[PDB]
Write an enzyme that holds these catalytic residues in place. Structure first.
Site, PDB file in Angstrom:
ATOM      1  N   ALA C  12      -8.584 -12.383  -5.344  1.00  7.05           N
ATOM      2  CA  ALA C  12      -8.843 -10.997  -5.710  1.00  7.05           C
ATOM      3  C   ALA C  12      -7.588 -10.360  -6.299  1.00  7.05           C
ATOM      4  CB  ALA C  12      -9.415 -10.208  -4.541  1.00  7.05           C
ATOM      5  N   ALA C  99      -5.709 -20.932   2.002  1.00  7.85           N
ATOM      6  CA  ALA C  99      -5.796 -20.599   3.414  1.00  7.85           C
ATOM      7  C   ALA C  99      -7.237 -20.684   3.919  1.00  7.85           C
ATOM      8  CB  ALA C  99      -5.248 -19.221   3.597  1.00  7.85           C
ATOM      9  N   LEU C 252       7.788   7.049  -8.209  1.00  7.57           N
ATOM     10  CA  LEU C 252       7.055   6.350  -7.180  1.00  7.57           C
ATOM     11  C   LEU C 252       7.376   6.927  -5.814  1.00  7.57           C
ATOM     12  CD1 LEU C 252       6.984   2.542  -8.040  1.00  7.57           C
ATOM     13  CD2 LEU C 252       5.201   4.351  -8.287  1.00  7.57           C
ATOM     14  N   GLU C 254       8.032  10.133  -5.292  1.00  9.70           N
ATOM     15  CA  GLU C 254       7.568  11.503  -5.164  1.00  9.70           C
ATOM     16  C   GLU C 254       6.130  11.552  -4.694  1.00  9.70           C
ATOM     17  OE1 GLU C 254       8.231  13.775  -8.707  1.00  9.70           O
ATOM     18  OE2 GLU C 254      10.420  13.629  -8.556  1.00  9.70           O
TER      19      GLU C 254
END
Ligand SMILES: CC(=O)O[C@H]1C(=O)[C@@]2(C)[C@H]([C@H](OC(=O)c3ccccc3)[C@]3(O)C[C@H](OC(=O)[C@H](O)[C@@H](NC(=O)c4ccccc4)c4ccccc4)C(C)=C1C3(C)C)[C@]1(OC(C)=O)CO[C@@H]1C[C@@H]2O
Ligand SMILES: Nc1nc2c(ncn2[C@@H]2O[C@H](COP(=O)(O)OP(=O)(O)O)[C@@H](O)[C@H]2O)c(=O)[nH]1
Lengths: 429, 441, 441
Positions: C12, C99, C252, C254
């Site tokens: 994903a 996994a 980033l 803020e």
């Protein structure tokens, strides 16, 4: 400013309004696609009364189309004017109404009204300063009657001070095309009493009578009768959209049309109505137009005013006309016919004069009458009602859907009480 | 989507359906190999084949219909015939022995063996539906499968579904013409599910159709094949406003709301007005006015009956084609004028009109001509009690001596069941005696 | 230079990144072969490709991103696909077995074997940075690599770096839709690093996106490819004020200063308002006022949630394109007016606006139309506790019978670890019960 939200409801509601937004869309030079192709900047000053301007000068109406049946919506989409509406305003279910009041008001109406009031708030939250609403619907249908009165009784809880008026089609006993239209009309007259500011009662027989006698038509369809009605609905809010010499909004009429609350059932009238060919033989004036408006044979309600008294009328003229001739004709009428007027009201007539006629002629006018003779409507229904209901016919399709008897008996009594409200205000000095 | 289910039960029920599903093939422009031809780049479920035809992938139209028989033989006329690849293979369900004009066999003995396979065919069509309208059971009172099985199915359809309309197209036993002598035994026992489980039962009979073919139509010698093209125009018009545009459309439920007064007073006869031979189709004045009057004719009835012997309770005009409504309202007002036509005194407002734009199709090799207008009148009347009095009397004759009782008891029912279904039908005939009469004060 | 690191973990996480790194290629005008075309004799890191693209010599743009999977297969869709020479070869790191939906395998067994090779890829990108901003981990709660490996990495990234922002873009398990039955096992165990090590975890889920595609957008049949173009416009706007000019730019950091009240209350859902199909893009009034109201819609949420069930704590408006601020401040004041919208009583000053000039790009073959304005609203609310109550209950069901325990214990973790990560998530859900409530005196 002074926007109008249009809620056309049911099958009948959609047909009229289909033809209604074919007139308004001609008043303002709207293309079928939604562009503007006018020449005069009068058409745009007050376009916003009906139309949201969208991106890149396209004009999307403020109309919401409601139905319990996919069919009418697919017709309108696929027609000449499908392009004009916003596709989020075609709100419709799948299971038909049954021409059953219970089915459109309780079972299958309540399911949908949530997804429709959420569209009412798209429209109402975008307006500058809303004036009013309007249903176009049918007393005698499933969605026109039932779902219409569910929408109304849920707007008074949200917008409790906007002029909400209806152009409601009422049944006539001469022309029947539904067996239980007394059941469906009785239970919705009950809702229109307590919830509406003005109600323009329209019939069927009254519209053939205009086609046959006045217009000299041959073969009328719903297509032709609602083409008339849409020329009335245009007239109502003309001075809201065009400049005039006397102006008159929705609210201006309402205020001095309606003596007492609850007596808000009006009889429209249009003039002129000629055949083609017989247009070069009427001279088109103000005494010509006044004589038609006080004629019985140009009522779109299947009654004769002579069976009562006008409480009040309003006269909405559209055209480059005088004010003396207007002020005189409207005088010479309520002198010569002083027994046809309620005498405890001086100056039964309100005039309004716009400057803008319809797009083919000069000097139209529109008569809106609060006559006492409208109890002739309510009694002809409450005779059919009480003739079926004494047998309890067609009852299981209603008690099956969440209703019971006691909704009927009360709704019959609310119709029969206002017969005794037009009756009081006809006679007794 | 306004989808609907046809079920065709027994020999008569199958063989009608041939004449039904011949027609819709012509209505929606479908070849007998299920294919729409190349000249249809227009809106399919906008012509709304999608109420009677599930469109299989790759341009292929298969009905929502199920052909059920306890006998292999009838359906095997559909395999081959010409319809051998119109139908889905799994909707042609055959038994091995028929009920053999024995209600006890069609309902208890033989019927139960295929009933779950048929109900499972329904679910495969029920789950493909979006906005399921209801069912159209075709049969004949006075078969074994048409009566015994239909009674078994309608029980099961009421339990699984409940809510939807369930129309029936019965053939009622004719007063003189009959070919089974236990014809009245199988009609008394089908009474039970017809009033209880169906929502609207239609009745036709063969003699009243023989009249129309010979007299209005100048066919010398009708067979069942000729009558059923007629039957199919009545049903084709019923269900046409679901599936074509017109002003005053009428769903399947708008009949019952406008046609049916009380719970069990739901036996309306149909008519059809433009039954005209090719030659007699000139010398027409086939306007709306004349075709409305023709519905009210006691000779143009589909039932051996005479509405001059009872009162109408509702009527219901379903018109197709080149129609202007005001012509209809002026033809109603004529109908209200006449005193030969008795409505009841509690009706007042006569009846419901419905119009549709799609004109009928002339069935190829068929008996009609090309008409522009066409009218079924579904109409409750108290004159259908007379059909019942003429058939109870045949039952009451044979059951007075307990004639064919030994066949029935030895198949899975009781002697007691005759006495209950006779009381059951005697109560219906008492309802129409009490529904014709006005109340006064 | 405002540089940032994308890490794309699991199936994903990779397949989102395809849809991310498709977009920035269009944002900064980069061909799929990494090349800016000849019509760009303008300022490159002035258009600031230089936060997501290290400019290799000879006019060539390669990301600061690392595609990590324990399975060879997913990334091999990126080799070839069309992006086969966009990516640096050494930033596409494959294992050999995944996994396999097992947290114990992604964190202990399989994950450790490639973890140092991945951390060493980070250093090769960390040392090329000047003014490193932080990391953007993409994954899904309820994979093995998305949960097990991500947990392993975030531990190592906290130790080596500490100081920088570490954003996550999770996919949360959907209440009905799920395809792995140990989906709740892998979500309870990823709880540990998500609250502790991440600085701001976002949650989305597939059902809340299915709604938006079908309803606002009239796509019949979404796949993951359709949803992730949507995901990418949310992230593309987040990080757009780093890398384009506008008034009220927002770094980033803020966000976190203006979005996040307390240490572990850092689970804000995003929205995005102009989700409009091409046809429905006319019949627009797509002003600032309408698009601000659309953010506060409970239907336009990216999480299966209804903010009418909780109170907002902060919001955060990030706008792109043709924007005048006073239109926004007048649309805020509307939002403060309504009583449907419950802020908390300790917020008072609602929220933070940020504007950017660069309009979005229409992704070619993409689902959006051309919009002039666009708004993500990152917004803390107490309604995301409801997403948790619906998933703890699925964990608590299966762990009551100790169902899939034998797979997990035999891979390098304990039975004891379930009881700690369940308490750990139960404390979060207790924090939002206690953060929704005002204090009174
Ligand atoms: C050569 C010429 O002058 O043609 C006229 C015409 O012959 C007459 C007969 C028209 C005509 O009207 C009708 O025949 C008619 C049909 C259905 C329903 C009602 C009427 C006309 O069709 C209608 C049309 O009306 C308009 O353009 C108005 O603006 C009107 N519009 C519509 O109803 C409409 C019609 C077609 C397409 C779009 C809109 C209107 C009225 C009130 C409020 C808004 C708009 C006009 C003047 C004419 C024709 C074209 C023949 C008349 O009607 C109106 C409403 O103006 C009927 O009596 C009047 C007198 C007109 O002189
Ligand atoms: N004026 C007018 N009335 C109509 C029209 N169509 C139906 N009606 C009326 O509406 C009622 C029937 O409701 P209908 O609109 O069929 O309900 P639906 O199931 O919602 O379509 C009757 O009283 C009719 O007279 C129309 O086109 N014009």
């Amino acid at each position: 400013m002074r926007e109008i939200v249009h809620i056309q409801a049911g099958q009948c509601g959609n047909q009229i309004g289909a033809k209604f937004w074919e007139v308004i869309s001609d008043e303002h030079g709207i293309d079928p696609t939604g562009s503007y192709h006018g020449d005069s900047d009068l058409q745009l000053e007050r376009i916003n009364v009906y139309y949201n301007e969208a991106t890149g000068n396209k004009y999307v109406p403020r109309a919401i189309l409601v139905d319990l049946e996919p069919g009418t919506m697919d017709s309108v989409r696929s027609g000449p004017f499908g392009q004009i509406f916003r596709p989020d305003n075609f709100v419709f279910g799948q299971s038909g109404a049954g021409n059953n009041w219970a089915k459109g008001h309780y079972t299958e109406g309540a399911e949908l009204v949530d997804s429709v009031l959420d569209v009412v708030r798209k429209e109402s939250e975008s307006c500058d300063c809303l004036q009013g609403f309007q249903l176009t619907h049918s007393l005698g249908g499933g969605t026109g009657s039932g779902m219409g009165t569910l929408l109304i009784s849920k707007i008074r809880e949200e917008y409790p001070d906007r002029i909400m008026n209806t152009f409601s089609v009422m049944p006539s006993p001469k022309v029947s095309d539904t067996v239980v239209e007394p059941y469906n009309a009785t239970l919705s007259v009950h809702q229109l009493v307590e919830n509406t500011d003005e109600t323009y009662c329209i019939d069927n027989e009254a519209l053939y009578d205009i086609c046959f006698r006045t217009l000299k038509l041959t073969t009328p369809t719903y297509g032709d009768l609602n083409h008339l009605v849409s020329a009335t609905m245009s007239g109502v809010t003309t001075c809201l959209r065009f400049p005039g010499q006397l102006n008159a909004d929705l609210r201006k009429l309402a205020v001095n049309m309606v003596p007492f609350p609850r007596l808000h059932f009006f009889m429209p009238g249009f003039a002129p109505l000629t055949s083609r060919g017989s247009q070069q033989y009427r001279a088109l004036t103000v005494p010509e137009l006044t004589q038609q408006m006080f004629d019985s044979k140009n009522m779109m309600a299947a009654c004769d005013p002579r069976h009562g008294r006008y409480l009040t009328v309003a006269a909405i003229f559209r055209g480059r006309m005088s004010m003396k001739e207007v002020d005189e004709q409207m005088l010479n009428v309520q002198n010569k016919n002083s027994s046809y007027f309620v005498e405890w009201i001086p100056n039964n007539v309100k005039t309004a004069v716009c400057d803008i006629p319809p797009r083919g002629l000069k000097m139209s006018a529109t008569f809106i009458g609060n006559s006492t003779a409208i109890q002739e409507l309510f009694k002809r229904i409450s005779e059919q009602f009480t003739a079926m209901f004494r047998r309890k016919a067609f009852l299981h399709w209603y008690t099956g859907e969440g209703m019971d008897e006691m909704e009927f008996t009360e709704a019959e009594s609310n119709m029969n009480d206002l017969v005794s409200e037009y009756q009081q205000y006809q006679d007794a000095t | 989507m306004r989808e609907c289910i046809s079920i065709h039960v027994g020999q008569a029920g199958v063989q009608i359906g041939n004449a039904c599903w011949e027609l819709y093939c012509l209505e929606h422009g479908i070849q007998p190999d299920g294919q729409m031809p190349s000249d249809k780049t227009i809106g399919g479920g906008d012509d709304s084949f999608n109420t009677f035809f599930s469109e299989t992938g790759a341009g292929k139209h298969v009905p929502r219909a199920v052909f059920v028989d306890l006998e292999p033989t009838v359906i095997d006329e559909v395999r081959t015939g010409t319809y051998r690849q119109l139908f889905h293979p799994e909707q042609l369900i055959t038994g091995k022995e028929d009920a053999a004009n024995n209600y006890a066999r069609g309902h208890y003995t033989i019927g139960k063996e295929i009933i779950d396979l048929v109900l499972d065919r329904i679910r495969k069509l029920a789950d493909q539906c979006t906005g399921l309208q209801g069912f159209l059971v075709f049969h004949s009172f006075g078969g074994g499968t048409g009566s015994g099985f239909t009674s078994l199915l309608m029980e099961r359809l009421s339990v699984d579904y409940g809510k939807k309309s369930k129309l029936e197209f019965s053939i009622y036993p004719a007063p003189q013409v009959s070919t089974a002598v236990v014809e009245p035994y199988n009609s008394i026992l089908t009474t039970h599910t017809t009033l209880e489980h169906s929502d609207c039962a239609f009745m036709v009979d063969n003699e009243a159709i023989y009249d129309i073919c010979r007299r209005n139509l100048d066919i010398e010698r009708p067979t069942y094949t000729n009558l059923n093209r007629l039957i199919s125009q009545i049903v084709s018009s019923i269900t046409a406003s679901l599936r074509f545009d017109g002003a005053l459309n009428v769903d399947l439920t708008e009949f019952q709301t406008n046609l049916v007064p009380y719970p069990r007073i739901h036996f309306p006869l149909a008519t059809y007005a433009p039954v005209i031979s090719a030659e007699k189709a000139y010398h027409e004045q086939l306007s709306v006015a004349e075709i409305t009057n023709a519905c009210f004719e006691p000779a143009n009835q589909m039932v051996k009956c005479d509405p001059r012997h009872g009162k109408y309770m509702a009527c219901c005009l379903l018109y197709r084609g080149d129609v202007v409504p005001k012509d209809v309202n002026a033809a109603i007002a004529t109908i209200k004028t006449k005193r030969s036509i008795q409505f009841v005194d509690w009706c007042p407002t006569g009846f419901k009109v419905g119009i549709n734009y799609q004109p009928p199709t002339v069935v190829p090799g068929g008996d009609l001509a090309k008409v522009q207008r066409a009218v079924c009148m579904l109409s409750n009347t108290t004159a259908i009690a007379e059909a019942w009095a003429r058939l109870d009397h045949k039952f009451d004759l044979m059951y007075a001596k307990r004639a064919f009782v030994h066949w029935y008891v030895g198949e899975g029912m009781e002697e007691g069941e005759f006495s209950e279904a006779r009381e059951d039908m005697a109560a219906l005939e008492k309802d129409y005696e009490e529904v014709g009469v006005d109340s006064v004060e």
